[PDB]
Amino acid sequence: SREEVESLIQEVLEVYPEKARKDRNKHLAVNCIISNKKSQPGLMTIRGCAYAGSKGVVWGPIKDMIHISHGPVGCGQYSRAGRRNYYIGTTGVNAFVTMNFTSDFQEKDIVFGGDKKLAKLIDEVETLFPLNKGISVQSECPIGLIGDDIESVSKVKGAELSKTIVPVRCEGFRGVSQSLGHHIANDAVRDWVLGKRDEDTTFASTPYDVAIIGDYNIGGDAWSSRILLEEMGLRCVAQWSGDGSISEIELTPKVKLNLVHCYRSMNYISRHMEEKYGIPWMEYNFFGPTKTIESLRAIAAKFDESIQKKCEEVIAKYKPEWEAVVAKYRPRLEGKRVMLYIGGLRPRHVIGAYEDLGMEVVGTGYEFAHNDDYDRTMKEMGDSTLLYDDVTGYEFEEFVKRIKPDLIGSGIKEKFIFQKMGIPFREMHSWDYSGPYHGFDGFAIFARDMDMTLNNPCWKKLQAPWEA
Amino acid sequence: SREEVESLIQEVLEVYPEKARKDRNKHLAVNCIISNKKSQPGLMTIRGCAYAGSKGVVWGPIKDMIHISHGPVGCGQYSRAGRRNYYIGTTGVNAFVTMNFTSDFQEKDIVFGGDKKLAKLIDEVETLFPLNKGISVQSECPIGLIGDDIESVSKVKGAELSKTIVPVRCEGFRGVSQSLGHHIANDAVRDWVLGKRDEDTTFASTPYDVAIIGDYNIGGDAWSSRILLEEMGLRCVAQWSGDGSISEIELTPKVKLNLVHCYRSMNYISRHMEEKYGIPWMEYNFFGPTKTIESLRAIAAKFDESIQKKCEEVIAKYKPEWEAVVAKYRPRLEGKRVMLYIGGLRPRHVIGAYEDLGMEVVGTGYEFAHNDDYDRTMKEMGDSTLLYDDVTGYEFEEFVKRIKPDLIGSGIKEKFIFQKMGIPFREMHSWDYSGPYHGFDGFAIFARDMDMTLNNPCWKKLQAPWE
Amino acid sequence: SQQVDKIKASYPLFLDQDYKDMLAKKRDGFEEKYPQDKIDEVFQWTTTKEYQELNFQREALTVNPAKACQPLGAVLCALGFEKTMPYVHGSQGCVAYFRSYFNRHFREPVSCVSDSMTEDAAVFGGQQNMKDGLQNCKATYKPDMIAVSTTCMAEVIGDDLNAFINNSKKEGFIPDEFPVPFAHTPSFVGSHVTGWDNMFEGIARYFTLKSMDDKVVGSNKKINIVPGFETYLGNFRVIKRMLSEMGVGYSLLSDPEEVLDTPADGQFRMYAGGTTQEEMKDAPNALNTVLLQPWHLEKTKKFVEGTWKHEVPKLNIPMGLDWTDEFLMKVSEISGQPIPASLTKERGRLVDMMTDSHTWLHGKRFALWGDPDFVMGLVKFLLELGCEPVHILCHNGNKRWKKAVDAILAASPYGKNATVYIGKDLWHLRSLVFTDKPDFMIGNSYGKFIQRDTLHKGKEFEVPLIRIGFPIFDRHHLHRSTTLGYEGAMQILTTLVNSILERLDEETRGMQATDYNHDLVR
Amino acid sequence: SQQVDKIKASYPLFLDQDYKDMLAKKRDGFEEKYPQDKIDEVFQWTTTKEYQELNFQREALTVNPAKACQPLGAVLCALGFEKTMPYVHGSQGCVAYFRSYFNRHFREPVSCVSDSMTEDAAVFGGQQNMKDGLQNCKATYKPDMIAVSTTCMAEVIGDDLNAFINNSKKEGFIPDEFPVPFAHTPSFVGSHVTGWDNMFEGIARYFTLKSMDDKVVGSNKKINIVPGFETYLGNFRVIKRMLSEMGVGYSLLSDPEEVLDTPADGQFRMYAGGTTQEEMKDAPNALNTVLLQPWHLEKTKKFVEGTWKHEVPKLNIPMGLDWTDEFLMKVSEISGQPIPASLTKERGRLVDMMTDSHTWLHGKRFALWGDPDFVMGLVKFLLELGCEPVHILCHNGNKRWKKAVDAILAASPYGKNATVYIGKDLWHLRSLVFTDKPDFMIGNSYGKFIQRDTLHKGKEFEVPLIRIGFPIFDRHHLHRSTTLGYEGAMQILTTLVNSILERLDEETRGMQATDYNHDLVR
Ligand code: CFM
Ligand code: CFM
Ligand code: CLF
Ligand code: CLF
Ligand SMILES: [Ca+2]
Ligand SMILES: [Ca+2]
């Protein structure tokens, strides 16, 4: 508690040069913390770039548009099919998510600019992929630095072909993390897509139209969330990004309520929909039985008596199922301690789900969260636990050596470090290729996965018997 | 050639103890040879046993019957799915060819006899495999040595269950090779299956009913033979053994002509259907265009004008096809020399196919052939080519080192020896998992296969650049 | 018909319409085939628990066995000694089969002779066969030793091998000092593995028994390793590699890895490598003898302890993490050689692979078969991986073995769904994979027909085969693999996780149907 | 719904009725999807020769590339030196991506840092970033060396790496003698292999350009081996193995095989093994330097020849029989060492495997891709196996390389139907396997999407992927394999024969339909 953790923090910080030590101290706390600032050079940040936030997370999931990674070959190549944002479609003809489309800049395009090449490739995309519903061009670092104007190319060619072409200025040098990429991406939706149906009266709205804002359908997560909402009576008109279509996004102007799962990535466009269309938005959580119950009730409360009965039906309709899951798995996971480190939602949103299996989250932190997210986090975290914003490689290793957690939940660049240390690790971005973890069906899988890994026979085997 | 081959033979025989030398001398000739004698102990004969000839080759292919390797577990395990006698069926339900059914003799059965155990397993076979249409028990070495009476059990159980149960005493110690197994198997067909429809007037025969005798359908060989005869208007009532059913065999007494491909394994039953039902038999060859054409011609001449004309049509139809085959591959195979060593038919029967590709067979031999097979062989080989009956491992290796053939065609126990010496080898029993080689379609696959192996890039790389 | 630029072999030739018609005409006209609906009915009945009940009540009928006979093992043992010829006294059909069976698995020459006992010998014995056989083989094939085994014929007529070999020496057919060890190997007692044990015991007794008066346990400072029936080249090679890594002096007694892998360089080599007669004579002077596959080496154990006076360690087959650890520590103990840094790293690299692959391996259900030692090691390793060895079949296993494996299963949460079957066979196992479907089978090539049967019931019921065992005939060069040590465990782990992942990719390859889960990264 | 005893992950969960229904409604209302019949029509159009001709006319759009960018290569080169931290000067997004990409292939930690240049640095340069960056990295991660490369932001704004490092030394942020080699690595020039070349020449130059006065070509009597961008641990390993058993003294320059394979023993090791600084400094004293992957080591060749004065042997990548022979003989020549009997035997055992497996491999058609040296070695070995390399694609290959390979093809009857494509990508290859269907693709995991597309057109049009290359993300531990030498040849030959035979068994697994050819023995 307090003194132990504060001693830990100061000890770790003493390896740094002073400038770095003073800055990093500001980002480590016991519950006071700052976030969303530049990373100190040379300290092995786990963060990515604004391009990752725009192409990788917001735009890339939209299945029927082609997303162009505009610039050199690297970025699009390392992000091809890395995020498991699931979609239904015929890929390569009507859906294109797992493909890598790039303008592959060579030196002539850096020295003279790639705008004529973007125009020629928009023509080619149109020849070879006729059934596409729109194009977005995700700028990588060189585009802004060399002075190109991807906006003229987008409205000229867009006008010339009656096709929505979205220019996105998400060059990796912008911002300090993937975070600004979300915002640049939210503004690119607002300016080139969201207003298209504003003069359209053709959609029959009902008092129960809703939209899921910020569920990227990792491993099917949006699908296991949606089902519960419609079994409660609501109609989900749009899924923002996960298995998303552009028409769903254009239809989001007609809903009655926006259901925000990922606050950090989507709050920007929600606040805008409220100002320009009066549509209210609310936040929820669909991680664990407690939270999904609490959430279905909160959403239903905002509708009326029929939907409230149906909500209580759904809750009884799954009480057998999730109660079986905790009965089976909680005795196996009771009192085990987890340390987490993920992006900008999941570090606080899965705490309850762990607690529903009797585990305690003794550390959590975020790559790119802002102070409003930490406000939200301190309510969920236990007294005297550890908080770390943009943790460095060194810090996370040293914190784990002293905290000794029983399970660590983080990403792929952290996975193999902690497994060699003998600590059970689960990937809390890709769900270690399992999942969904959302909803009650997701809770089942989540619970099986934490147990199979935390209680796996291999952890008893790290020490050789002759070196006992 | 001439006395080089003669001196080579006495050179090789010099290593033997005198008894072995005197015997082996009579089994090696230059194209004069004694065959179907026992093998000399310890000289690594390539031969198999009477069980191999009965179970492995004659009865095993019959699709809808169950065959029991009766005795210890070895015999039926090593023969399980080793020969590629192809069939159409649902295995384990109505067809059973690739399965290994055995009585798995343990010491109490040796000490007190397996006849009781045989009756029990026949009931077990009947509960668990109700769609079987007959059973055959293939005796392994202990059954005769032990004094069992599988005949009594077969009559009793056959009676009881109204089931055709064939006892076959093909114990491996009988005879000198798998040849006597063919004879035992033919006599067991004779005595227990072939007579069953003798009073049946019911089969509507036609003048053109024929039966293929001695084609075990290796890689589909009988199917590419059948199609040609059928196109020539004949009707094949039966296929003996390859893809054969027991009813086809019981119906074979109604045909007009027995067409014998494998003389050695089935001339015995042909002679019998001739004596008893008056059915004539004739030998034919379906390896390579030349032999297939004169066989279709000879078979057609046994019938009336229509069939002679359908024969000429069939020949005219395949002419462009086999000629494109020879056009592509004979310039690749021309003048290459082949040494063969196979069992009892194919050592003489494939020579014509090789010659259709401009290749010559400089040596050939048989594991278990008899003197009427060699009389037939001499007609096919060149003067001064080497003839070897029941060749020892040593002799074959030495003959190959001297003659230095460009290709050797023989079995699985010979394959890897010659490949390490750098000689192209093709398996002439299992067709090296390729085939069919019979008929016109089989010639295309044969030509392709001889080419791919004899002309394979790997043979230039056997010696390291530094030695 | 053939098109000369795309020649078709049997598949797909017989799928051509004319052939398809001809085959339909053949069955309809002459085969009197049971109607398809009856066939389908019986096939569905053979997948039921009722068929299974009846199937498991069999007492006399064996269908699709998972063992072969004693002289097959005796020949493989003999083949591991320097320049020796395996000789099986009895009927020749047996040798043509033993040779072909191993030729198909190793894709190599397998040299072995018979002394061709015929009808007459069945009444008068096979003495003259031994006399001429030995002389002919020594002259023609020039072995430094002949290792005599037996076929069932020579067993039933009760030929005294010892008398016959002594009478051949007496009559001057082979010289008095020429090594002719022997073993009686009856096909009706136990199986192929028993023949290996009987043969090895025979050879050890031959070079050692009447020489014990000067053997000092320990003076050559080596440990003897007896491999047992072993058909993976990588296993002989990994045991030698590990002992050399530890600086341990050893004697691998019966080592066929050179003769089963000669180079194709323009010449055939009939003999190559192998354990020398001098190693066998000196083998009493070793510190101790370790039996790598103890459940089929009981006769060799009794002889090494009883006559060589070696305290054979209670070691399981060095398969999987724990048992390779125990092996290495016992070797350390006996030889006073420390387990080197390289083996500690290698152990941890196996443990690392385990941590990386555990999510796809967890709770995967397996049906498996093979020889007793192979099976128990594979069972142990599957439990270490967090998998479930649900149907464990060993046709030639015995009651005490079954007890030892149920014990190993009882010691793990992952053993709770598993049953061990001894004396049962692959048609028995066919029932078990239909009625209590596992995910995969781990077995030898005979398993392909069980996979074909499960696929006929339907895709959801197909149980894929992972080929690990003996014989493997329908794949090339898998006889080069390793299943022992940390190396062998690394190979098996890789094969299991990737069989799971290939199957997962086949199920998620449906465009717009299942390919939502057709992940680039797994 | 879920059953607590049988939980379904995504596949098969979303096939359950209520989800199938739920997704049907979502589509039809809101998605405004093109009708299935149109989808099918467009799909058949993308398989055509018509579509192919338009696709091959692309000048500006690249779809599914088969190359990555320069700094990825530099990081891999840098990780091969003893206790070295890779440092990419520019924006951090790139480093997150480089580390993830290698993490996924090797299933290992990948340590690399950035100095996190942002918008600010784009107007004023990244000098302070380099200053604080180096200092921070050195104190926090404690490398003995920091090897610097660049991202495209730093390249485009023109930061002088040399001056920036020199001013960090001058200004006291890092010791004047702390090793900081650099190389500029623009993502818009060449590819990842070019990045490895640049980084290697930088580290080579850093350690030798000044010291040249005391260097005697040959005095340490070692041969230097430069591996190139290499992602198979077995390849580093087999080169070392063969040179050591030949008794050749050598220095592998950039050796990552320990850092990419540490044991899971309770500790995480950031650094492990690697080429020592001492070896890089002593490297001009070697007899000569052999480049294992010459086609992407051009800058390194010019420096090793022009400054170390080594006559670099014209050797191709040691893949296949002939190029492993040429390699061993050139090494013999320079070292004065004979090629030992163990390596002659191994060559012969590979040739033996070739003779046993040729009938299945003969004339099999392949489509293939990867890096230039890898692809030409694979081509060479396919021709030696009697197979036809029909579609050879190398996105980052150049005109001189395409000539070299066309000359390899020209020298074989098996090269007659093969075409080499440089500058083309995997959507181009998707069309070539539709219109000129091969039997298999040999490629990295991005090829799975092509196999899924060919399968959608129909089962008889499906081209199976055989995974050999980089990156392999959807199978586990194949990074441990070998593709070089006789060993690598033996592994590729076994994967090819066996992929052919597994494909044949799935095609003949149809009960009473195709299983007449479902042979036990092949
Ligand atoms: S690291 Fe989510 S704010 Fe963003 S990819 Fe993961 S903790 Fe992202 S919940 Fe999401 S789907 Fe994410 S897991 Fe917000 S979308 S930039 Mo890496
Ligand atoms: S070795 Fe035929 S007499 Fe008999 S199994 Fe082959 S050369 Fe036989 S043609 Fe035949 S189908 Fe044969 S190939 Fe007569 S059946 S005992 Mo080994
Ligand atoms: S921060 Fe982000 S990922 Fe980085 S480059 Fe910038 S948009 Fe992109 Fe791209 S090609 Fe390679 S990986 Fe970079 S050096 Fe350029
Ligand atoms: S000639 Fe059988 S393989 Fe032998 S030792 Fe007995 S089980 Fe074994 Fe022919 S019938 Fe058979 S195969 Fe021989 S035994 Fe005789
Ligand atoms: Ca071989
Ligand atoms: Ca690892």
Please state, in angstroms and rounded to a whole number, the distance separating the CA atoms of residues A159 and A164.
Answer: 8
Distance (Å, rounded) from C-alpha C484 to C-alpha C343? 14
B346 lines ligand 2 (CB under 6 A): yes
Query: Measured between alpha carbons, how far is A370 from A195 in angstroms, rounded to an integer?
Result: 28
Residue C339 vs residues C101, C252, C331: alpha-carbon distances, Å: 39, 19, 9
Residue type, position D178, single letter: F
Q: Are residues A111 and A233 in the same domain?
A: no
* DSSP per residue, B340-384: E-BSSSHHHHTHHHHHTTT-EEEEEEESS--HHHHHHHHTTSPTT
Tell me which residue in C329, C352, C522 faces A465 most closely, judged by beta carbons. C329
- Record: fold of C320-363+484-522: Nitrogenase Molybdenum-iron Protein, subunit B; domain 4 (1.20.89)
Total length of chain A: 468
Last residue of a domain, one of B148, B169, B192: B192
Q: D475 vs C522: CB contact, 8 Å cut-off?
A: yes
B338-356 CB burial, b ≥16 within 10 A, e <16: bbbbbbbbbbbbbbbbbbb
Q: Do A14 and A2 share a structural domain? A: yes
Give the span between the Cα atoms of A468 and B12, in whole angstroms.
66
Residue having the nearest C-alpha atom to atom 6 of ligand 2: B343
Nearest to D487 by CA among D343, D317, D293: D343
Q: Strands B101-102, C62-63: parallel, antiparallel or unpaired by DSSP?
A: antiparallel
* B323 assigned to some structural domain: no
The answer for residues whose C-beta is within 8 angstroms of residue D201's C-beta and 6 or more apart is: D183, D299, D300, D302, D303
Which member of D110, D118, D137 has the closest CB to residue A42? D137
CB of B35 closer than 8 Å to CB of B366: yes
Number of Cβ within 10 Å of residue A157's Cβ equals 17
CA of D261 to the centre of ligand 6 (A): 7
DSSP class of residue B43?
S
CA distance C284 to chain D (A): 31
- Give B262's contacts (C-beta < 8 A, 6+ positions apart): B213, B214, B215, B216, B344, B345
Among D227, D180, D247, D219, CA closest to D309: D219
> Is the bond preceding B320 in cis, omega lying within 30 degrees of 0?
no
Q: Whose CA is nearest to atom 12 of ligand 2?
A: B429
Whose CA is closest to C300, among C195, C224, C204, C399?
C204
- Give the pairing of strands A101-102 and D62-63: antiparallel
| B/D Cβ contact: 3+ pairs below 8 Å | yes
CA atoms of D429 and D408, how far apart (whole Å): 21
Same domain as B175, residue B199: no
If you ran DSSP here, which 8-state letter would residue D515 be given?
G
CB contacts, 8 Å: D30 with chain A: 237-238, 245, 247-248, 251
Q: Do B128 and C42 touch (CB under 8 A)?
A: no
Q: Specify the pairing of strand A281-283 against strand A337-340.
A: unpaired
Probe site for chain B from C55, C62, C477 (most B CB atoms < 10 A): C62
* Residue A322 is assigned to a structural domain of this protein: no
- The Å distance, Cα B400 to ligand 5 centre, comes to 19
Indicate if B188 and B74 belong to the same structural domain. yes
| Ligand having the closest approach to the CA of D116 | 3
Name the residue among C356, C456, C514 with its Cβ closest to that of D511.
C456
Statement to judge: residues B383 and B436 lie in one domain: yes
* Phi, psi for residue A207 in degrees, rounded to 5: -55, -10
CA distance C396 to C390: 19
**Ligand closest in space to the Cα of C268:** 5
What are phi and psi for residue C380, nearest 5 degrees?
A: -55, -50
- Ligand minimally distant from the alpha carbon of residue C188: 4
Q: Hey, what are B290's tokens?
A: 């030349």
DSSP letters along A429-446, please? TTGGG----SHHHHHHHH
- Range of A3's domain? 1-49+332-466
Which atom of ligand 4 is nearest to C72's Cα?
8
* Joined tokens for residue D460: 């008889």
Q: Which residues surround ligand 5, an ion (CB under 5 A)?
A: C 107-108; D 352, 356
| Of the candidates D64, D393, D70, the residue with the CA atom closest to the CA atom of residue A79 | D64
For residue C144, what is the DSSP state? S
Test B82 with D355 for CB contact under 8 angstroms.
no
Number of helices (H), then strands (E), belonging to chain B: the values are 20, 14
Residue A240 lies in a domain: yes
By the 8 A CB rule, do D292 and C378 touch?
no
Token representation of residue D119: 């918008």
Do A24 and A207 contact (CB within 8 A), yes or no?
A: no
Instruction: Enumerate the residues of chain D whose CB falls inside 8 A of the CB of residue C502.
Output: 475
* C355, C386 contact by CB (below 8 A): no
**Same fold for the domain at D69-214 and the one at D320-363+484-521?**
no
The CA distance from B92 to D482, in Å, is 43
User: Token pair 């709205």 is at which residue?
Assistant: A205
Resolution (A): 2.0
Distance, CA of A442 to CA of A375 (rounded, Å): 27
Q: What is the three-class DSSP state of D466?
A: strand
| CA C299 distance to own-chain centroid | 19
Q: How many domains does chain B have?
A: 3
B278 and B348 share one domain: no
Please say whether the dihedral angle defined by the alpha carbons of residues C283, C288, C290 and C291, taken in this order, is positive or negative.
Answer: positive
> What are the residue boundaries of the structural domains of chain C, listed by start?
69-214, 215-319, 320-363+484-522, 364-469
Q: How far apart are CA D15 and CA D25, in angstroms?
A: 14
Residue B270, min C-alpha distance to chain C (Å): 20
Are A69 and A99 within 8 A, CB to CB? no
What chain B residue is nearest to D321 in terms of C-alpha separation?
B461
* B56 and B185 inside one domain: yes
Pairwise CB contact (< 8 Å): A433 & C383: no
C342 assigned to a ligand binding site: no
Q: Which two tokens stand for residue B324?
A: 């494109």
Determine which helix (DSSP H) or strand (DSSP E) holds D148, and give its type and residue range. strand D145-150
Same-domain status, A59 and A122: yes
Q: After which residues, if any, is chain B broken (C to N > 2.5 Å)?
A: 31
Q: Which residues, other chains included, contact A173 with Cβ-Cβ below 8 Å and sequence gap of 6+?
A: A49, A50, A141, A144, A145, D91, D117, D118, D119, D121, D122, D153
Q: Are residues A135 and A248 in the same domain?
A: no
Q: Which CATH architecture has domain D364-469?
A: 3-Layer(aba) Sandwich (3.40)
Going across the sheet that includes B209-215, the strands are B235-241, B209-215, B257-260, B281-283
Q: Which of B37, B3, B5 is nearest to B22 (CA)?
A: B37
Contact C384 A461 (CB under 8 A): yes
| Any atom of ligand 4 within 6 Å of the Cβ of C114 | no
- Torsion-angle region of A226 (φ positive above 0: left; ψ -120 to 50: alpha; else: beta): alpha
CATH number assigned to the domain comprising residue B298: 3.40.50.1980
Strands laid side by side in the C288-291 sheet: C250-252, C223-226, C288-291
A243 contacts in chain D (CB < 8 Å): 26
What was the experiment behind these coordinates? X-ray
Q: Which atom of ligand 3 is nearest to the CA of D71?
A: 14
Preceding peptide of B436 cis, ω within 30°: yes
Contact C348 D455 (CB under 8 A): no
- Give the H/E segment covering residue B171: none
B205 and B179 in a common domain? no
**With contact defined as beta carbons under 8 Å apart, do C231 and C479 qualify?**
yes
Q: Show the beta-strand stretches assigned E in C395-498.
A: 419-422, 440-443, 465-467
DSSP code per residue over A152-217: HHHHHHHHHHT--EEEE---TTSSSSHHHHHHHHHHHHHHHTTTTTTT-------TTEEEEEEE--
Backbone angles phi, psi at B430, to 5 degrees: -90, 5
DSSP string covering A90-115, please? Answer: -BTTTB-TT--EE----HHHHHH-SH
- Partners of C352 on chain A (C-beta within 8 Å) are 419-420
Please state whether C265 falls in left (phi above 0), alpha (psi between -120 and 50) or beta.
Answer: alpha
Nearest residue of chain A to residue D428 (CA atoms): A128
Distance B140 CA to ligand 4 centre (A): 6
Q: Work out which ligand 3 atom sits closest to the CA atom of D98.
A: 12
Identify the CATH class of D69-214: alpha beta
The question of whether B183 is a catalytic residue gets the answer: no
What does the alpha-carbon distance between residue B316 and residue D134 come to, in Å, rounded to a whole number? 86
Annotated binding residue at B49? yes
**Closest by alpha carbon to A247, among A292, A187, A194?**
A194
| Residue C124 burial by Cβ neighbours in a 10 Å radius (0-12, 13-18, 19+) | exposed
Do D454 and D207 form a contact (C-beta atoms < 8 A)? no
- CATH for D320-363+484-521 (1.10.260.40, 3.10.180.10, 3.40.50.300, 1.20.89.10): 1.20.89.10
Catalytic residue (one of B21, B80, B83, B370): B83
Residue A316 within any structural domain of the chain:
no
Residue type, A148: D
Contact between chains at D516 and C11 (C-beta distance less than 8 A): yes
Q: Which atom of ligand 3 is nearest to the CA of D94?
A: 4
Amino acid present at D441: M
Residue C394 annotated as binding site: no
* Residue D375 near residue D392 (C-beta atoms within 8 A): yes
Residue B322 lies in a domain: no
Closest to A251 in 3D by CA, of D32, D36, D24, D33: D32
Q: Are A69 and A198 in contact (CB under 8 A)?
A: no
Q: Which residue among B73, B251, B448 sits closest to C30, beta carbon to beta carbon?
A: B251
A287 with A404, same domain: the answer is: no
Q: What is the 3-state secondary structure (H, E, C) of D248-312?
A: CCEEECCCCCCCCCCCCCCCCCCCCCCECHHHHHHHHHCCEEEECCHHHCHHHHHHHHHCCCCCC
Half-sphere exposure of B378 (CA within 13 A, CB side): 10
Fold of D215-319: Rossmann fold (3.40.50)
Q: How many CB atoms lie within 10 A of CB A202?
A: 6
